[PDB]
Amino acid sequence: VNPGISVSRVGGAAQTKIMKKLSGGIRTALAQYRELAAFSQFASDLDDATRNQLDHGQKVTELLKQKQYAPMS
Amino acid sequence: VNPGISVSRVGGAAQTKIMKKLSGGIRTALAQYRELAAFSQFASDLDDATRNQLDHGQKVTELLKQKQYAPMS
Amino acid sequence: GLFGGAGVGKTVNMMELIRNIAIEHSGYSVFAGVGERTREGNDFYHEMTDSNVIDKVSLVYGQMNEPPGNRLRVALTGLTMAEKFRDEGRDVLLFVDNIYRYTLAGTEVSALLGRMPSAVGYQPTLAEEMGVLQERITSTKTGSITSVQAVYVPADD
Amino acid sequence: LTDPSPATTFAHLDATVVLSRQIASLGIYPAVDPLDSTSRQLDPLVVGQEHYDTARGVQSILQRYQELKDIIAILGMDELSEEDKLVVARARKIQRFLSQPFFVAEVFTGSPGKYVSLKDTIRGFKGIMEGEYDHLPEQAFYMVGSIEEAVEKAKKL
Amino acid sequence: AMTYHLDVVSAEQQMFSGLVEKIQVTGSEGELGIYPGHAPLLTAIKPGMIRIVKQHGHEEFIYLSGGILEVQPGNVTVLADTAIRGQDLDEARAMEAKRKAEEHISSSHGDVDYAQASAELAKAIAQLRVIELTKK
Amino acid sequence: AGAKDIRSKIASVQNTQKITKAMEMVAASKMRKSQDRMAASRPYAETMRKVIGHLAHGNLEYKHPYLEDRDVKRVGYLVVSTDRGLAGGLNINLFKKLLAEMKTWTDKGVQADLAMIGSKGVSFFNSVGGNVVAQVTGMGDNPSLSELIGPVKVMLQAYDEGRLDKLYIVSNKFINTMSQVPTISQLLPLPASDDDDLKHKSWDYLYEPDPKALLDTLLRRYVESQVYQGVVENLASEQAARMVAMKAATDNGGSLIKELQLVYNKARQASITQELTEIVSGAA
């Protein structure tokens, strides 16, 4: 899926006060992992905020990955 | 004309065991000289191995010459 | 002219206008949406209740559920309607919808017209229509007609 | 140029000339597309080699300055290869160099000018080819007289 | 044992600093220690660990490469060649610089970013014919 | 053309800018680290001048073989040469002013010898040709005194030889954040610092051996510091200067991009056009 390229006016009105509540940082941060990830190519030797944030970001993305033909709960 | 700008499916059936034989390097030199172009941009990035290639390619380049009107022996 | 957009809460701006018309003046104006997502509309009606000020102004809305002949037609309506109030010697300003919706409707008409479209397929006379529109607005000797409009911004070409 | 009108031009064309609205835009009075224009009649054998040759060379320069023109625009000149840089000097100089006054021309610009002698030109071919005058002023060369004249300028200018 | 004004320093790095009221160290030519009240003088000392009593009875053996340490009136400071200057030695270097000068030789920076950058410049500029289409 | 050539250009532009920002940012970081890091140079040298001179009050009176150095025969200059890419005009300025001095020397006609450090000015000189004993290169971000040594000792062979009277030493001083002035140096001159010997040295001076050892040796050591430092200033300055270039170079292209925008504008117009003419045409 286009990573944030896709867009929905509707939003999380229907979302569960937990599910609703908890869901924010993925949008923004996840944006910042793609976005931020840029430097790595050229950049090197970054500080830790980048390190951890980035790791949580990339690996987190791994967590995001989902199997074809698979259910969820 | 440009190497690879012009191509023919007929190919080298006509080329003579000597003529056919001796003719190979063209493409690479083509490539090479063409490919040589790549680093020309980044000025002064390369060593003599390169220089021997590139030189050789300038040389072949030179080797190409023709009159406006000439017969061929 | 209008620049701004989704997430602007332009209605906030509008409501500001509501308090602004009454508060500022007796003069009261109404605008009408056409060719538009309905939910916004009804929500804006509720939002009128919340606003509660809706009384001063009212309009039919196009909502884009409709056929063009209606749509393109709508303009003349508001023209006449405010023409009550500026005709009332009252004076006012109304908001306006996506023009490109409107003019484009012009072309759909022209194909409908079977007539040769303007270039880039505009309404071959579409300018003329604009003549109608822009030509319409005036602050009369005895009345004032202002307005704002947001037209469908097409690729920002 | 795709103009099929222009097609029938070159097609039917016998002799022709071209002009550069950049070169014009360059403020150059003469303003012709030199790189463009060409003489079927030009023959080196006819022209001897010196003509054909030298002309070829300038053509090469043009090819080059055109050629790097990109690289500069991108990078500026900061990286200029020595040799290249030198050529570039010769370049702006050579363009700048072509220009000379014309006697009848004093109308447009009060400045007069003169008829020209081919041999003198041939000399120019060498000295330029030489870059013979190393200190030569760039501004001087434009709309300028002979290497003697430009040498008089060179004295003052 | 900290003295008054003392430091072990190179422009590159100051090894220690502050006062040391006792310093065991072997002078190049003679026995060396630190204790207040001696007169100003200058010396150099052979390399080795120098065990010096410093403030609050801190004391430590500090490896010297040897070098010139001296004490002005009221002041103490330590200079040393990070490495003792070799005899011959940089002679070999003159050889290498005469060979090198004569016979070309190179030494390279390591920034991958520089390498990547070059790729970026050629590559970037590469495939740029676009200037032709451009008009001006 | 057809965003094939137009968009093709665009991606060219985008990747371009990306490279640009990366360039700028990273470049900056390097530069800042450089400024921060370079600060440490003063200490031992400062000691060396203060100390050195204080001794010189009546003691310098004894002898000045070193101060004599070499008699007017050959002149000289130090040189450094760059390991860093796209830093800026630089060796333009340097190699330039150098050319000027060289002019004076020919004007002097006095003999001279060159020595370089690094690849770039090695490419000036080497490219330029000249008379250079030797060069040293590639110590890179970590300069090392020991690395400096062999170079330095070869150098010593001069005053040693006393072969060449005076010798320059060049690096561009820092005009600070805004700038770094270029700098060129007298050398195989005496330092001629008269402040520290001004008062008769008060501290009791006990020299087990003769100081001459400290003169040749210590003198050498101290002089080296100036080298190392001015090297550094050249260095951080390098990092910043390049850093600055990054921004501007980057900025320029966007204009072109806008032009291209016009190109896909004329073009959008165009597809609209041939398409349109063709649309009438299909109407036929």
Curated annotation (Swiss-Prot), chains A, B:
Protein name according to UniProt: ATP synthase subunit alpha
Residues the UniProt record annotates as site (Required for activity): S6
Gene: atpA
Top-level division of the source organism's lineage: Bacteria
Species of origin: Escherichia coli O45:K1 (strain S88 / ExPEC)
Family that this chain belongs to: Belongs to the ATPase alpha/beta chains family.
Function: Produces ATP from ADP in the presence of a proton gradient across the membrane. The alpha chain is a regulatory subunit.
Subunit structure, interactors included: F-type ATPases have 2 components, CF(1) - the catalytic core - and CF(0) - the membrane proton channel. CF(1) has five subunits: alpha(3), beta(3), gamma(1), delta(1), epsilon(1). CF(0) has three main subunits: a(1), b(2) and c(9-12). The alpha and beta chains form an alternating ring which encloses part of the gamma chain. CF(1) is attached to CF(0) by a central stalk formed by the gamma and epsilon chains, while a peripheral stalk is formed by the delta and b chains.
Compartment list: Cell inner membrane
UniProtKB/Swiss-Prot annotation, chain C:
Highest taxon of source: Bacteria
Record localization: Cell inner membrane
Binding site for ATP: G4, G5, A6, G7, V8, G9, K10, T11
Family: Belongs to the ATPase alpha/beta chains family.
Assembly description: F-type ATPases have 2 components, CF(1) - the catalytic core - and CF(0) - the membrane proton channel. CF(1) has five subunits: alpha(3), beta(3), gamma(1), delta(1), epsilon(1). CF(0) has three main subunits: a(1), b(2) and c(9-12). The alpha and beta chains form an alternating ring which encloses part of the gamma chain. CF(1) is attached to CF(0) by a central stalk formed by the gamma and epsilon chains, while a peripheral stalk is formed by the delta and b chains.
Biological role: Produces ATP from ADP in the presence of a proton gradient across the membrane. The catalytic sites are hosted primarily by the beta subunits.
Name assigned to this protein: ATP synthase subunit beta
Gene source species: Escherichia coli O45:K1 (strain S88 / ExPEC)
Lineage: Bacteria, Pseudomonadati, Pseudomonadota, Gammaproteobacteria, Enterobacterales
Residues of the full protein shown: 147 to 303 of 460
UniProtKB/Swiss-Prot annotation, chain E:
SUPFAM superfamilies xref list: Epsilon subunit of F1F0-ATP synthase C-terminal domain, Epsilon subunit of F1F0-ATP synthase N-terminal domain
Chief location bin: membrane
Transmembrane feature ranges: none
Cellular compartments annotated: Cell inner membrane
Keywords for the protein's UniProt record, in alphabetical order: ATP synthesis, Cell inner membrane, Cell membrane, CF(1), Hydrogen ion transport, Ion transport, Membrane, Transport
Pfam entry (one): ATP-synt_DE
GO molecular function: ATP binding; proton-transporting ATP synthase activity, rotational mechanism
Oligomer status and interactors: F-type ATPases have 2 components, CF(1) - the catalytic core - and CF(0) - the membrane proton channel. CF(1) has five subunits: alpha(3), beta(3), gamma(1), delta(1), epsilon(1). CF(0) has three main subunits: a, b and c.
Function (record text): Produces ATP from ADP in the presence of a proton gradient across the membrane.
UniProt xrefs under HAMAP family: ATP_synth_epsil_bac
NCBIfam families (alphabetical): ATP_synt_epsi (TIGR01216), PRK00571.1-4 (NF001847)
Name by which UniProt lists this protein: ATP synthase epsilon chain
Source organism of this protein record: Escherichia coli O45:K1 (strain S88 / ExPEC)
Underlying gene: atpC
Swiss-Prot record, chain F:
Disulfide pattern: none
GO biological process, alphabetically ordered: proton motive force-driven plasma membrane ATP synthesis
Keyword Ion transport: yes
Cellular component terms (Gene Ontology): plasma membrane; proton-transporting ATP synthase complex
Cell compartments where the protein resides: Cell inner membrane
Assembly, per entry: F-type ATPases have 2 components, CF(1) - the catalytic core - and CF(0) - the membrane proton channel. CF(1) has five subunits: alpha(3), beta(3), gamma(1), delta(1), epsilon(1). CF(0) has three main subunits: a, b and c.
Role of this protein: Produces ATP from ADP in the presence of a proton gradient across the membrane. The gamma chain is believed to be important in regulating ATPase activity and the flow of protons through the CF(0) complex.
Stated name of the protein: ATP synthase gamma chain
